[PDB]
Design a protein around this ligand. Structure first.
Ligand SMILES: Cc1cc2nc3c(=O)[nH]c(=O)nc-3n(C[C@H](O)[C@H](O)[C@H](O)COP(=O)(O)OP(=O)(O)OC[C@H]3O[C@@H](n4cnc5c(N)ncnc54)[C@H](O)[C@@H]3O)c2cc1C
Ligand SMILES: Cc1cc2nc3c(=O)[nH]c(=O)nc-3n(C[C@H](O)[C@H](O)[C@H](O)COP(=O)(O)OP(=O)(O)OC[C@H]3O[C@@H](n4cnc5c(N)ncnc54)[C@H](O)[C@@H]3O)c2cc1C
Ligand SMILES: Cc1cc2nc3c(=O)[nH]c(=O)nc-3n(C[C@H](O)[C@H](O)[C@H](O)COP(=O)(O)OP(=O)(O)OC[C@H]3O[C@@H](n4cnc5c(N)ncnc54)[C@H](O)[C@@H]3O)c2cc1C
Ligand SMILES: Cc1cc2nc3c(=O)[nH]c(=O)nc-3n(C[C@H](O)[C@H](O)[C@H](O)COP(=O)(O)OP(=O)(O)OC[C@H]3O[C@@H](n4cnc5c(N)ncnc54)[C@H](O)[C@@H]3O)c2cc1C
Ligand SMILES: O=c1[nH]c(=O)n([C@@H]2O[C@H](COP(=O)(O)O)[C@@H](O)[C@H]2O)cc1Br
Ligand SMILES: O=c1[nH]c(=O)n([C@@H]2O[C@H](COP(=O)(O)O)[C@@H](O)[C@H]2O)cc1Br
Ligand SMILES: O=c1[nH]c(=O)n([C@@H]2O[C@H](COP(=O)(O)O)[C@@H](O)[C@H]2O)cc1Br
Ligand SMILES: O=c1[nH]c(=O)n([C@@H]2O[C@H](COP(=O)(O)O)[C@@H](O)[C@H]2O)cc1Br
Lengths: 226, 225, 223, 227
């Protein structure tokens, strides 16, 4: 076992200060000392999204670099990621599991995917294994020779696992979920890559425990952020 | 009857913030040093991103001209009571007797100096007269059925407003660097006194939740990382 | 007389670098235009619409400047009353402005005022603004600092600012700050900020007419 | 198809609307022992009145390896649009450092202190990178030829693979990026970015200094801190 292949993307809530009541208090500018549902839906209907920002959630995310790229495009979040300049990188790499769709149909612009055969999945695993094993063998060879970490890592693939903290408020999370989940009955159907979708679904599940009224209204109003 | 007040109030409504939150974010917790050592190193190296993984929510009550200064900080979240939606209460700010009332030097130097007893009585007299007329006309307009969003056009920028203001500690430190006047800081900023009163109460509340960060912030010249 | 009353809200485009071709080049990462801009809006790929800029000079009363300044994706710089004495120019609504309201506060439902309602607004505004500005000048004349003297001035006092946006930020602003029955969402901005937004949209339509047409075709929502 | 190794990082200014006059106009909006423009800009720079420097725009075309694009894209005040590997097959161009790059590191990880490598160090880098990039690309093409979707085939490509994007900033955002992404031992804050993002930053700065020379002079005069 020269390297570790994994197919999992992990998201854990580290900390938070978020509830449906926090929205109602901000919207009302509440002083020290069905109505929650009605208020939260009123804000979604009127696109008064600002009260949904007065909260926070922090997630620990472990995902391949190509997926962390998609996550880090959302400029309303805060991130802090482990550095390959700073620390040697572990030989853990992502490959898609047996249920991941492997084939494409239609125009490139459609991001429409379809199932692959059992030999498609085998070919992906064979090809990834060879490429990742060679990449990590050369990375460690360079490190052993005394080459700086920030240069040695040039040979590592975008499937290399990384880990980070990602913090959002609920408004930023709903904008992220609108773009990074593919829901055919949403107001807008987005076509994100499956891997960042896996992140987003786990974030949504965690959020729905903290803010179940807002989570329900968000889907009811077409999964767009107010 | 109008009410004159001189207070600016800040109350911490809610928070999720601690120096350990910074340490965890910096280390991505899942150097063999200390919380002080790591927070100083981030502060001096301007590695400010770990200071964002937290939140504080303040309830602020201040005159409109001071809320304007608060709401220029685009890294924060705000939600304020609306005069289009609800009639405005008759509370108006006037400076207290400690406030500096005169200016010297160039306009861009914002250098204020003490006023006399006469100066302060003059300010209270003019303000009382102007705000009594404004509120009397606001009330007359509302009484004759003019819409609230139009009637408030006569109300002064000293009218109090209340809002929630939410930040993370990086955004708070950036705000403090600009909205407190500290002779000894790396950059001496010249904010108006009233927004500095808001800033100071925010900083007092913050130093309770993140004392190591608060101390490193002043140690390095009050510049946000 | 000692004060100036005006009812106009002005917007002028000061400079720009914005075109539909700038959107295409960003989307294609360049080293029909209508078809591509429509595809971006349908797919909410709004990022290519940020690679441009427009700078507006806006003159409006403070209560409306507050509404404009809530849009955090823009850049602003406004004349300071801490720095400079304030001029005696104050806003009052013109005769076409709707002056009364019905229904619940959250409906924002305005209805016409009579000729009398409008005279009453002008009479009360003149009285209040006159006293404010008399006291402001009295305090300035006594040597009280500019930043304290202006405590008496009303939220109707005019201010002036530069406001710079890219097309994505302008569309997000127009979706919230115009009331349009051809939009996906009927928003209820105050008429004065809507006057700023209408002039911005008019000037933007000359620079990026494909994008301006696609914005309305897709429901007046920012991509 | 053969791979291509390159060491260059390129930045071109695609378009702009930025000048020192645009700052002065934004700053003085209204109803010195030298030029009033340099006077005003120096005053804003030292007073950290940065807002006036936002009323402009510059758009760059940048070509760089993914690991360096990652550094550029952390700056949330900019706008970006990058070529996509989900959308289009990736070209066979891969970054390797040139012979002048420092290849060794001394001291603590947080010091970011780099020192010269030997001729043998450079050769060993080119050797290992060549071998890894050739196997990656051969496997990427094998996957593509097999009909595997391009968003999954690119899993095997290294972070040295070149990408291309537009990056748009105003001058305030550019100054904040230059303070962090250039290593200037004279600056008020000495930052230790990776050399490759520093190459991007130096080219951007050279372009910007032609569009806004008084601003650029003031930024350096005051310690390379964004207002
Ligand atoms: C009819 C009307 C009624 C209003 N009533 C009130 C009121 O009663 N009280 C009040 O204070 N304001 C009120 N506002 C102001 C409103 O809350 C917004 O501040 C203003 O409309 C700007 O909207 P925005 O935040 O979407 O835009 P911007 O600030 O321009 O932001 C654009 C988008 O960027 C994203 N974004 C930016 N910053 C963040 C962040 N920190 N977190 C998450 N996402 C972010 C969101 O997707 C946001 O929609 C009202 C506005 C209107 C139009
Ligand atoms: C003494 C003083 C005098 C002032 N004079 C005036 C005046 O005459 N007129 C006036 O209009 N305002 C004035 N202001 C307000 C000032 O211009 C800023 O609006 C306010 O200080 C908030 O600072 P900020 O923009 O740095 O903060 P934030 O909005 O919180 O932004 C924080 C930082 O994020 C970055 N940033 C955020 N958005 C952008 C962006 N779009 N482009 C580039 N970088 C961005 C910058 O690094 C910025 O410093 C003054 C403020 C003070 C304290
Ligand atoms: C030498 C070096 C080492 C680094 N080490 C790591 C690392 O180990 N891990 C890692 O993940 N990154 C690391 N980074 C990336 C770094 O954390 C920042 O993401 C990058 O430098 C952008 O800086 P910025 O956030 O200040 O800029 P921008 O994102 O452009 O923001 C500019 C300014 O706007 C304000 N601002 C904007 N958004 C917010 C917000 N949500 N809250 C509060 N203020 C805000 C702040 O004042 C900020 O300084 C490193 C960078 C350098 C130069
Ligand atoms: C299916 C898919 C395809 C994609 N294709 C590409 C691609 O080919 N190339 C590529 O580079 N990226 C691509 N992206 C990434 C995409 O362009 C965005 O970077 C990402 O989706 C984040 O969206 P956002 O900018 O709206 O979010 P955020 O950065 O979180 O911003 C949230 C909202 O704030 C506002 N906002 C924030 N900053 C600004 C600003 N400076 N100006 C104006 N408004 C602002 C806008 O309303 C924005 O929607 C793709 C993403 C998806 C989901
Ligand atoms: O010098 C740096 N610049 C950076 O931008 N970062 C970010 O931190 C993460 C890891 O970067 P690294 O290149 O693997 O060290 C990634 O998101 C980078 O964009 C890390 C360092 Br260290
Ligand atoms: O129509 C609206 N637009 C707004 O921007 N606001 C914000 O809410 C605050 C109160 O505004 P009002 O104009 O007093 O209602 C102030 O910050 C406004 O900018 C409120 C309303 Br309601
Ligand atoms: O000290 C200052 N703080 C500020 O925020 N401003 C902004 O500049 C504008 C004019 O504010 P002033 O209080 O009239 O000077 C307004 O948008 C303020 O928010 C101006 C000064 Br000067
Ligand atoms: O689905 C998408 N999500 C994305 O975020 N992107 C961004 O565009 C760039 C190219 O991503 P790709 O994963 O190589 O297609 C990178 O900056 C991504 O973050 C591109 C696509 Br397509």
């Amino acid at each position: 076992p020269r390297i570790e292949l994994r197919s999992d993307i992990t998201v854990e809530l580290v900390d938070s200060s978020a509830s449906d009541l926090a929205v109602v208090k901000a919207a009302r500018v509440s002083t020290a000392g069905g109505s929650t549902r009605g208020l939260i839906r009123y804000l979604m209907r009127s696109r008064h999204g600002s009260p949904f920002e007065h909260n926070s959630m922090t997630f620990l995310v472990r995902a391949p670099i190509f997926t962390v790229r998609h996550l880090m495009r959302h400029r309303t979040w805060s991130f802090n990621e482990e550095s390959a300049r700073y620390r040697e990188v572990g030989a853990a790499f992502y490959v898609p599991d047996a249920t991941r769709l492997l084939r494409q149909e239609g125009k490139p612009g459609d991001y429409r995917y379809v199932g692959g055969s059992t030999d498609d999945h085998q070919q992906v695993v064979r090809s990834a294994t060879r490429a990742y094993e060679v990449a990590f063998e050369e990375y460690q060879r360079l490190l052993d020779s005394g080459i700086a970490r920030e240069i040695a890592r040039l040979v590592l693939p975008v499937s290399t696992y990384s880990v980070l903290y990602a913090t959002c408020n609920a408004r930023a999370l709903m904008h992220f979920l609108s773009l990074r989940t593919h829901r055919p009955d949403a107001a807008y159907v987005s076509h994100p890559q499956r891997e960042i979708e896996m992140v987003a679904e786990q974030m949504e599940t965690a959020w729905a425990k903290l803010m179940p009224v807002t989570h329900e209204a968000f889907t009811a109003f077409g999964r767009v952020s107010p």
